[PDB]
RNA sequence: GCGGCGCGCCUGCUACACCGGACCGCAGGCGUCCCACGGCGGGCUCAGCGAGGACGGAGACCUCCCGCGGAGCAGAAGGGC
């Protein structure tokens, strides 16, 4: 009645995405937001194609992206969901594993809110993997790995109730 | 979110005269050197037994001509209509949003559509 | 003299020339409820260049902001008196006066009221002089979605 | 017949499975452009099927996952990767 202990689960990674158009400054006044925050370089993703309704035109940052992981993780995590108070919507677990959640104010997180920063909402998204994937991303022997080690959301949804107590 | 120094449900539980302490000058003189009209207060009897005694789905959300009455801690929860001049407008009272009346609440003006 | 202009505190440069009491009315306003009422006094020299002050009258002064009631303040010279939060007198400093303002501002939006359209849609609040008066500026009612 | 230019040149047909095969026959182009749109070495995987995530939806971003090329390689089309 015991699982494999390589069968545990462990936040690989966070995502920590904001899109605010280009506007004048704006993306390098969320530069400041996301550095405090991770304590890490936030890389400028950058807009595709030029359209209508928002003002993206193939070349302008779009949005600001830093992957936090390992101790980081936890923390940065943990304050998402007190601020989200241990509540998350059911859906956001997805086929290979992978929640997300919404964060107003990034200020919310304990950030102090500022004349200087205006408020800039961001968004997280956790990717939860299983030791034993690097079977996927080695440059030498790429592979795909199996069906049961793969996250199903089911087994993700439990291991966030064990990690964080949360409800849906 | 916490209100006047109680949390949302302490001041929710606490009693007109438990909140009335710390409040503006206008809602502290309201029972201070005054107190309620008897229409008004028998309106406060006609909601409160309601809100305490709810068997589902509320079937009240009485419709009151009165409308400048000071909010009190225990109505909240509750829609009540607040008329203005010519509709009643339905208001839930947020508990954050009691110590003040429910005049500043509800709109009996037209917001804007003009400028022509 | 040691006239030391700058002397920048609380992210707000100085000057020296201003006496010792309007630079802190002068601390970009925000952050200094005023009429010197205390800030006449505090500890600090009445008109003397700002600059000049020393750091241990200046980390007097900083403490006596810090805590208003410790000095012997009276409250009625503080600006929250009864706060709608855990409901504590309290002074506003340079960076909360803006956080405060979005707590009033955001707090109106959300229990959604007269006062709040009157903010939102950008309407003088109180006045009611959107009538006849401030052609001024175009913040007026105006409208025009179609 | 100067209304057109098959009057030099190229792609796919017509073309009758080596090749060569006509026509003011069809479906189209060329007369340029780029010191990076070049050479090389390294990394990388692309358009997208889904399923998720502040605002945020046909649609903008960020994630995984399955992704034989369904992408882009300056322009005609056909090979090719």
């Not at chain 1, 199996?146 to 439990?158: L, M, Q, V």
Request: aromatic share 6%; hydrophobic share 35%; glycine share 8%.
């Amino acid at each position: 009645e015991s699982e494999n202990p390589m069968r545990r689960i462990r936040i690989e990674k966070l995502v920590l995405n904001i899109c605010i158009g280009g506007e004048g400054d704006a993306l390098t006044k969320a530069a400041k937001v996301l550095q405090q925050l991770t304590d890490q370089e936030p890389t400028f993703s950058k807009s595709r194609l030029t359209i209508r309704g928002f003002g993206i035109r193939r070349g302008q940052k779009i949005s600001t992206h830093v992957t936090v992981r390992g101790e980081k993780a936890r923390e940065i995590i943990e304050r998402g969901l007190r601020v989200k108070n241990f509540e998350l919507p059911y859906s956001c677990f997805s086929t290979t594993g992978n929640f997300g959640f919404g964060i107003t104010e990034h200020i919310d997180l304990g950030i102090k809110y500022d004349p200087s920063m205006g408020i800039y909402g961001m968004d997280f998204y956790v990717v939860l993997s299983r030791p034993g994937f690097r079977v996927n991303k080695r440059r030498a022997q790429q592979q795909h790995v199996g069906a049961s080690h793969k996250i199903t959301p089911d087994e993700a949804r439990a291991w966030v109730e064990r990690e964080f107590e949360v409800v849906y | 979110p916490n209100f006047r120094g109680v949390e949302v449900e302490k001041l929710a539980t606490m009693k007109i005269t438990d909140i009335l302490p710390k409040l503006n000058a206008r809602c502290r003189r309201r029972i201070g050197k005054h107190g309620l009209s008897m229409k008004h207060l028998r309106f406060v009897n006609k909601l409160r037994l309601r809100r305490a005694a709810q068997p589902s789905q509320k079937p009240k959300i009485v419709r009151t001509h009165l409308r400048d009455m000071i909010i009190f801690p225990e109505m909240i929860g509750m829609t009540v209509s607040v008329y203005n001049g010519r509709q009643f407008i339905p208001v839930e009272i947020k508990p954050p949003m009691v110590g003040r009346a429910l005049r500043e609440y509800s709109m009996s003006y037209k917001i804007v559509s003009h400028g022509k | 003299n040691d006239y030391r202009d700058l002397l920048r505190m609380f992210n707000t440069n100085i000057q020296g020339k201003v006496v010792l009491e309007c630079a802190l009315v002068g601390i970009k306003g925000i952050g200094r409820r005023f009429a010197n009422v205390a800030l006449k006094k505090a500890n600090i020299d009445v008109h003397k260049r700002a600059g000049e002050l020393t750091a241990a009258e200046e980390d007097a002064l900083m403490k006596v902001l810090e805590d208003p009631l410790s000095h012997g303040i009276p409250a009625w010279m503080l600006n929250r008196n009864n706060d709608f939060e855990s409901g504590k007198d309290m002074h506003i400093l340079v960076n909360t006066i803006a956080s405060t303002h979005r707590a009033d501002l955001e707090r109106l939006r959300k229990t959604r009221c007269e006062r709040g359209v009157r903010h939102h849609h950008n309407l003088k609040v109180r006045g009611q002089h959107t009538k006849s008066t401030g052609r001024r500026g175009h913040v007026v009612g105006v409208q025009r979605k179609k």
